[PDB]
Amino acid sequence: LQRARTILEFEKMLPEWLRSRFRMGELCKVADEDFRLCLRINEVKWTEWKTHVSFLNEDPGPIRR
């Protein structure tokens, strides 16, 4: 919490144009018009062995190219 207490204050005393792009930006949603909302990528492990209905892509690890 205390290092979290610090880190925002540095950003608060950073009025630049925010070059530190901390995120995947404007990565498209499933909604056909809503291709907005910057996102995140994370990793999960072995549980709940099943078929997966919902997906977004043709399963690469990073983005293509």
């Binding site: 062995w49 099943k50 078929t51 997906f55 399963d59 690469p60 293509r64």
Partner: protein, 115 residues
């Protein structure tokens, strides 16, 4: 008439009627050019120009509670023009996750029955 985009749609949903109309159409177009590329041109109409992905690879991407009939008629089309061995044992050739036949997906999709 971008039939590839039509049939990649048509397996993504999984309408067997729409698939069959695509199946009747492309076979009818195949009979018009009965020259030398009767295994080759039909394969290229199934082959993705980027990724090497066939319809069958696209098929095993989206699971569907109709897909057993879908693959069955699809393979019946593959046996119809004698392309099945070239078709089934075709692999991912876009050198990212390469060498992946769709058979890989079938175990990964936990569908051992149709596998």
């Amino acid at each position: 008439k971008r039939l590839k985009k039509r049939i990649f749609a048509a397996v993504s949903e999984g309408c067997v009627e729409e698939l069959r109309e695509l199946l009747q159409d492309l076979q009818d177009l195949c009979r018009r050019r009965r020259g030398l590329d009767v295994p080759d041109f039909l394969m290229h109409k199934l082959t993705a120009s980027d990724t090497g992905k066939t319809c069958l690879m696209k098929a095993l991407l989206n699971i569907n509670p109709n897909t057993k009939e879908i693959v069955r008629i699809l393979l019946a089309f593959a046996e119809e023009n004698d392309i099945l061995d070239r078709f089934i044992n075709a692999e991912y050739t876009e050198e990212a996750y390469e060498g992946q036949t769709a058979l890989n997906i079938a175990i990964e999709r936990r569908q051992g029955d149709i596998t």
